[PDB]
Amino acid sequence: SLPACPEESPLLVGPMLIEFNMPVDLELVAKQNPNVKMGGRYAPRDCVSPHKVAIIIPFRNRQEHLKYWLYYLHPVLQRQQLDYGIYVINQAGDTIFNRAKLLNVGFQEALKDYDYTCFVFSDVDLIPMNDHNAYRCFSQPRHISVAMDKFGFSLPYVQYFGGVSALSKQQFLTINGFPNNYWGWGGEDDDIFNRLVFRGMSISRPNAVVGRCRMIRETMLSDGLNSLTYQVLDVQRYPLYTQITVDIGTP
Amino acid sequence: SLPACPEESPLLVGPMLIEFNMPVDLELVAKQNPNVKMGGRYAPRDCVSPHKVAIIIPFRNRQEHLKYWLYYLHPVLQRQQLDYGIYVINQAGDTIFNRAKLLNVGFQEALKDYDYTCFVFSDVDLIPMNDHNAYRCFSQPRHISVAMDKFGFSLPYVQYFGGVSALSKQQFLTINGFPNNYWGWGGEDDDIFNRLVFRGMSISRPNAVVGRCRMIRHSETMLSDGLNSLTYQVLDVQRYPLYTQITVDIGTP
């Protein structure tokens, strides 16, 4: 019935100022984005998007950062004319953090809501400075956070495929998702760039200016999606996001 | 007879001023480094170095840049107490450039002079700003150019394992060297990161400050495409005081 959305959205505004010297009230953010449905779900009214994107945020005790993330990304994602939903994967307990495992949980859980075909894995503390940085999938795995605010050496904050990146369902399934046994922060050695290589994939990215983000301030075949185990303890449908609280075990 | 050189050389000075305004005369540079022998060869007089390093530069019509590279790196390499030689691999003709294939030639040709055990592959237009950045090999593949001088975003110039990197002879042979069929400038698409992964190796590097480099300016297929399938024709070999230049025909796409 509806027409397909254009290939490039005409609603983009380009670079935007990101400042964190202003308190955020999510009740106001919700009234500013009234087309977002309960649970953080949105689709264009005027056209059909081919981008069915689940944005997955690994999370634990970062509510202030999340307020800023929602305040800044909901307008961006709509301007990009995406058919998206927001899934916050909250790691229950005080175990060592396991980013990769939570991303696997988010993939499995988001698919219970809707047949997403693209998955954006995003740290809660990275805001894109230009809405030309598409939050969706490409013919190759996509690295969305390319460089940081002040355009310095960026590998510490984003590694090769960290910070914000995107994988289609097929790309995610080809590598059997992320590993589940990397507890803690391992740097550019725990980057799953290795998994993309084994399956003959490379990295796509925008240019470093469009890709700027600002900060709020083998074993593969057996360790991954097919061996994932976890227990969901809570699911909360807030106006602007879904939060899933899970027990992912211990190292 | 001689003692082993220390693990860290006592001659290191740390950060360095790098400027590209003074014209360079290689006859004067040779008089500044009188211990460098014909062909750009040096070994310490006072100790035996465990680092037998061939520095291989893929090259074509960049003589001005090459002057600066020699002016700045010969002092650095000597201070690092290395047993090294300088090999410039000049691609004959003005065909489309093939960085990776030239690197394979340099590895094969350097070994005809001397039994090097470490190979540093360095773009001619990258100068290290700190002599603590070791131009030699490690237990894992080594990425020497980590970050750029000022605007630190470095991925376009260094990729994952480009710019300046080092592979021991064993590490190089394990991945069957570099590919030979990547014609042109491919960026991080021509990067051999996949080959290191395929063989269960990772990247070692210094921290981004020690690893800072400045750019000269004024502004499956692995097992079958590599060293074992390399073909080329040497057209000239010239032995200058400060470097060996090998001019080769590496064919066309």
Residue numbers in the entry:
A (entry chain B): 126 to 342, 364 to 397
B (entry chain A): 126 to 344, 364 to 397
Direct quotes from the study:
Beta-1,4-galactosyltransferase 1 (B4GalT1; EC 2.4.1.38) is a family 7 glycosyltransferase residing in the trans Golgi. B4GalT1 possesses a type II membrane protein topology, with a short N-terminal cytoplasmic tail and an α-helical transmembrane domain responsible for Golgi localization, a stem domain (amino acids 45–125), that is believed to be mostly disordered and whose function is still unknown, and a globular catalytic domain (amino acids 126–398) carrying the sugar transfer activity. Previous structure-function studies of the catalytic domain of B4GalT1 by x-ray crystallography revealed that the enzyme undergoes conformational changes upon substrate binding and during its catalytic cycle.
The closed structure shows two molecules per asymmetric unit, with no significant conformation difference between the two chains. Despite the absence of the lid in this structure, the position of the Trp loop (amino acids 308–311), with Trp310 facing the inside of the catalytic pocket, clearly indicates the presence of the closed conformation. Specifically, the one-turn α-helix usually formed by residues 274–277 in the open conformation becomes a β-turn in the closed conformation (arrow a) and residues 280–284 transform from a random coil in the open conformation to a one-turn α-helix in the closed conformation (arrow b). In the closed dimer of the wild-type B4GalT1, the H343 active site residues are 35.5 Å apart. The homodimer structure solved here most closely mimics the one that normally exists in the ER, or alternatively, in the Golgi in cells overexpressing only one of the players needed for heteromer formation.
